[PDB]
Amino acid sequence: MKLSDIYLELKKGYADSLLYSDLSLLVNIMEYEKDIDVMSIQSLVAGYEKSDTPTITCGIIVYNESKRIKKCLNSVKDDFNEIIVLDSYSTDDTVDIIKCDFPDVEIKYEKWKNDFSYARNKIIEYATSEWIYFIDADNLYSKENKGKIAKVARVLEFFSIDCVVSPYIEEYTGHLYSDTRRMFRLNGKVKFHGKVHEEPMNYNHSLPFNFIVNLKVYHNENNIKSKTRRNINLTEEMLRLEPENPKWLFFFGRELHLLDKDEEAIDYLKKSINNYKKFNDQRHFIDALVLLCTLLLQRNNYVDLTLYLDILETEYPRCVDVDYFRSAILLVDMQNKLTSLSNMIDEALTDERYSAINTTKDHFKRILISLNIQLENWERVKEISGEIKNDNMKKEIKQYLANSLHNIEHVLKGIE
Amino acid sequence: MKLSDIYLELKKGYADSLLYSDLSLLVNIMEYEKDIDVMSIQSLVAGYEKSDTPTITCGIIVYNESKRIKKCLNSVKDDFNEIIVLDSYSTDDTVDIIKCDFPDVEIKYEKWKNDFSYARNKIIEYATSEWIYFIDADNLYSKENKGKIAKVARVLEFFSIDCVVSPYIEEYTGHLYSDTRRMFRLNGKVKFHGKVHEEPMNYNHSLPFNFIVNLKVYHNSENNIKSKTRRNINLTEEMLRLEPENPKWLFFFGRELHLLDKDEEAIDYLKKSINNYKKFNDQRHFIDALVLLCTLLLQRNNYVDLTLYLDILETEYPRCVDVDYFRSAILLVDMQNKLTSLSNMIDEALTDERYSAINTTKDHFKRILISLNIQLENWERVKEISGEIKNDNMKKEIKQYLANSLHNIEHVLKGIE
Ligand SMILES: O=c1ccn([C@@H]2O[C@H](COP(=O)(O)OP(=O)(O)O[C@H]3O[C@H](CO)[C@@H](O)[C@H](O)[C@H]3O)[C@@H](O)[C@H]2O)c(=O)[nH]1
Numbered sequence: 131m132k133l134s135d136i137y138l139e140l141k142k143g144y145a146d147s148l149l150y151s152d153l154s155l156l157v158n159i160m161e162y163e164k165d166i167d168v169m170s171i172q173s174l175v176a177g178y179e180k181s182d183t184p185t186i187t188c189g190i191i192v193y194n195e196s197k198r199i200k201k202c203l204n205s206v207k208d209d210f211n212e213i214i215v216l217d218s219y220s221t222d223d224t225v226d227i228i229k230c231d232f233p234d235v236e237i238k239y240e241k242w243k244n245d246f247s248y249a250r251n252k253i254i255e256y257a258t259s260e261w262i263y264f265i266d267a268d269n270l271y272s273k274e275n276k277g278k279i280a281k282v283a284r285v286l287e288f289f290s291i292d293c294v295v296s297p298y299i300e301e302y303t304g305h306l307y308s309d310t311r312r313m314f315r316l317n318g319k320v321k322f323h324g325k326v327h328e329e330p331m332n333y334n335h336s337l338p339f340n341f342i343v344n345l346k347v348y349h350n351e352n353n354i355k356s357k358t359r360r361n362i363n364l365t366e367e368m369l370r371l372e373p374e375n376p377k378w379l380f381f382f383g384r385e386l387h388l389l390d391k392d393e394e395a396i397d398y399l400k401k402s403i404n405n406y407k408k409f410n411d412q413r414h415f416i417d418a419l420v421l422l423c424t425l426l427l428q429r430n431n432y433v434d435l436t437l438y439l440d441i442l443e444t445e446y447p448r449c450v451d452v453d454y455f456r457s458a459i460l461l462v463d464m465q466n467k468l469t470s471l472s473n474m475i476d477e478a479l480t481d482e483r484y485s486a487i488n489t490t491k492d493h494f495k496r497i498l499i500s501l502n503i504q505l506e507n508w509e510r511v512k513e514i515s516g517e518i519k520n521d522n523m524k525k526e527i528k529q530y531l532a533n534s535l536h537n538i539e540h541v542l543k544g545i546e
Numbered sequence: 547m548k549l550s551d552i553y554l555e556l557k558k559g560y561a562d563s564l565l566y567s568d569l570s571l572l573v574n575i576m577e578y579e580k581d582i583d584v585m586s587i588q589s590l591v592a593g594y595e596k597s598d599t600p601t602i603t604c605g606i607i608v609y610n611e612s613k614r615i616k617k618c619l620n621s622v623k624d625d626f627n628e629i630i631v632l633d634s635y636s637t638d639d640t641v642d643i644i645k646c647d648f649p650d651v652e653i654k655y656e657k658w659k660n661d662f663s664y665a666r667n668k669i670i671e672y673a674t675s676e677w678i679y680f681i682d683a684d685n686l687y688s689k690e691n692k693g694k695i696a697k698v699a700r701v702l703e704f705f706s707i708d709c710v711v712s713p714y715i716e717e718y719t720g721h722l723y724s725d726t727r728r729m730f731r732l733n734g735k736v737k738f739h740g741k742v743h744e745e746p747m748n749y750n751h752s753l754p755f756n757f758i759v760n761l762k763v764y765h766n767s768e769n770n771i772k773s774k775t776r777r778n779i780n781l782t783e784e785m786l787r788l789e790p791e792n793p794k795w796l797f798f799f800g801r802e803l804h805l806l807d808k809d810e811e812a813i814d815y816l817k818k819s820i821n822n823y824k825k826f827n828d829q830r831h832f833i834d835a836l837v838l839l840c841t842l843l844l845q846r847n848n849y850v851d852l853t854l855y856l857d858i859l860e861t862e863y864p865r866c867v868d869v870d871y872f873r874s875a876i877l878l879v880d881m882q883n884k885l886t887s888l889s890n891m892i893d894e895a896l897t898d899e900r901y902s903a904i905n906t907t908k909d910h911f912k913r914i915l916i917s918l919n920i921q922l923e924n925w926e927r928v929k930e931i932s933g934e935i936k937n938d939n940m941k942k943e944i945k946q947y948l949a950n951s952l953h954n955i956e957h958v959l960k961g962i963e
């Protein structure tokens with residue numbers, strides 16, 4: 131059997147049950163290709179209510195998080211049995227904000243070596259439970275996960291599936307990450323690797339299966355500039371060890387972008403993309419393509435965007451962002467068609483050629499306003515709008531300029 | 547020696563001369579086909595110095611014209627010497643605004659028969675000068691037409707040219723008419739024909755040649771237009787029922803139907819007029835028929851039939867810039883269409899079972915939509931869509947972009963006029 135099959139058989143067969151109820155916190159089930167050996171589907175829902183419920187501990191590593199450690203721990207101090215904060219010798223409060231308001235949370239210490247894995251890996255060895263789940267301090271643990279976490283541990287042990295576990299992280303942007311690898315069995319197998327952009331690897335160097343489970347965490351400045359300068363130092367390091375690695379070329383390339391060094395980021399993204407072709411962990415391959423495409427787009431480099439676009443479209447055909455960059459290009463072509471039309475109208479007006487409608491060629495000025503407003507070309511519309519030579523056209527334009535003046539401050543009203 | 551060549555031997559040479567000054571008040575000159583008997587050039591400039599300067603009477607027919615008759619007669623009184631004013635028994639004052647300030651302008655009377663040419667007769671009779679000039683109550687004789695009139699009458703009497711004379715008459719819309727036919731020699735050769743849309747004709751009903759001269763005459767309107775039209779159409783329909791296949795009248799009746807908001811029917815007459823001008827001799831208003839049918843076809847969003855009448859407009863009057871106006875409007879409508887079809891092709895897209903790697907919220911798609919419908923001025927949907935974006939920084943920039951164009955509108959709106 132495949133876990134996929136087991137879930138189906140449990141749908142019409144045993145949707146009554148608890149094994150079912152708790153197996154539906156697993157999003158990711160049709161991805162699990164390993165045989166789960168079973169000899170009776172009936173004995174299984176029955177043996178699941180007899181199953182042990184495991185212990186989860188919650189590891190947080192903090193530096194100067196005076197601003198956000200309170201809301202963080204509040205989200206989380208009721209959902210675990212043991213919470214371990216790992217102070218890297220904060221210069222501000224943090225430590226004592228924790229000590230009075232949160233009496234039950236262990237506080238430990240560790241000087242910062244420039245290694246998120248070493249820190250993270252301390253809390254692993256300090257931790258007493260039999261699963262761990264990591265959460266960072268600017269993050270917040272949805273009210274919705276109440277009583278759900280250990281249910282996820284329980285099923286995965288009940289089938290004894292080896293995996294790390296990703297909840298959904300929702301960016302403050304609303305962007306929703308699902309390769310987060312934040313929870314895993316505390317059983318000697320599996321330890322963080324990497325000075326930065328670290329993730330749990332099962333220690334034969336690995337790459338464990340990832341259950342996306344149905345748990346959620348939410349956000350809680352222009353200190354992005356701060357954090358990024360910190361990480362690029364670490365990323366460039368990790369990359370100099372493996373200078374041809376597509377993941378590291380992309381990671382570095384990305385942070386270069388974040389430090390607006392876009393021309394240099396495009397080079398690393400172009401190299402990352404060449405190297406993913408024949409390379410096994412293709413997880414961030416898409417992230418390189420859609421970033422190189424936006425940067426190429428932002429530099430009005432349509433030929434190279436089209437080339438990379440065809441790659442994104444053949445390598446990931448069900449990615450909607452292909453349709454995004456194609457739209458963006460048509461809309462560019464339309465701008466030029468508008469401009470070219472604005473330009474033959476000017477060429478027309480400057481002949482000897484007479485008008486039978488309005489000898490003042492003043493109806494042409496209706497189209498040219500219309501057409502340069504559309505092009506956002508207020509420079510040239512303000513102009514054209516003086517060259518008008520008649521009251522009742524002027525009378526016509528100002529009354530139409532107002533009804534859109536007031537349609538704007540109507541939509542501008544009800545956003546913020 | 548033709549006339550346009552006499553003007554080349556003055557412009558090149560005899561160029562400070564009094565003949566050349568008065569002859570540059572004639573615009574229409576290379577059109578004058580008749581040849582002229584000269585001695586030399588010299589003989590001809592000096593004969594002009596010893597020539598004359600004829601007299602011009604100014605004719606005005608009027609009905610209830612209380613509001614404009616004062617401004618009118620001002621423009622004219624210091625410029626003609628004799629001006630007759632034919633009242634048609636106007637029920638309001640009018641006649642006595644003329645009494646007061648304009649004592650030397652000889653108010654004659656006449657009962658109104660529905661015949662504009664006939665009213666123009668009765669002023670040709672009473673007139674005593676050599677040339678006549680006509681003007682209407684809603685026009686103002688331009689300030690800068692100072693003593694230019696009789697220089698026109700001189701040059702035309704000197705070469706003893708037969709013709710009618712057209713000043714430029716300015717619409718309330720700023721448009722300049724130059725087939726106006728307002729001045730002619732009072733030598734029993736020229737006279738108005740036609741109950742309405744009268745013009746001066748030779749006595750064999752032929753068509754006097756039209757010098758366009760360099761005189762400006764302006765305007766003074768709101769909704770007297772609907773009542774003037776409703777009167778004129780009564781006459782026009784009569785004249786039409788006489789030659790019911792005459793394109794000039796098919797056009798005139800269609801035009802007035804239009805001015806009375808009977809557009810659906812105005813097009814039917816414009817179409818027949820355009821069909822009949824093909825052959826027909828006097829094609830003066832052929833162009834006016836086409837461009838009015840085109841502008842109405844545009845208003846009704848009938849682009850298929852617009853294109854077809856635009857072709858005819860283009861083959862017949864290729865140098866009319868109004869061709870390009872209509873081709874432009876079409877091209878631009880096709881743009882709008884491509885845009886809205888993209889708006890929808892984008893919409894279909896961000897529903898499918900299809901994910902984004904850039905932003906799960908697809909909020910970047912929604913920004914492209916917002917930007918289409920701002921361009922499409924579909925402010926309706928700019929509102930819906932901007933409610934469903936969850937990234938506060940984009941919602942901030944939509945706020946700041948709208949403010950940009952809000953400010954720039956309120957800026958261009960200021961310095962119009
Ligand atoms: O010297 C430090 C710096 C940070 N932290 C804490 O550890 C986490 C690091 O997160 P952060 O300061 O937010 O850096 P980011 O770049 O925003 O975090 C991303 O990048 C890190 C570096 O790989 C990852 O560990 C995180 O999972 C990932 O959210 C946070 O809880 C910090 O408070 C420390 O304990 N010591």
Ligand SMILES: O=c1ccn([C@@H]2O[C@H](COP(=O)(O)OP(=O)(O)O[C@H]3O[C@H](CO)[C@@H](O)[C@H](O)[C@H]3O)[C@@H](O)[C@H]2O)c(=O)[nH]1
Nearest residue numbers: 607608609611634658662665682683684742743744774778
């Ligand atoms: O029973 C009338 C009605 C009007 N008028 C006067 O005649 C002139 C006609 O001008 P208007 O009343 O403004 O009519 P429109 O339709 O605006 O004028 C156009 O249409 C008329 C009919 O063809 C022409 O006389 C004009 O030259 C032409 O400008 C004006 O001075 C009127 O005051 C009369 O004499 N008798």
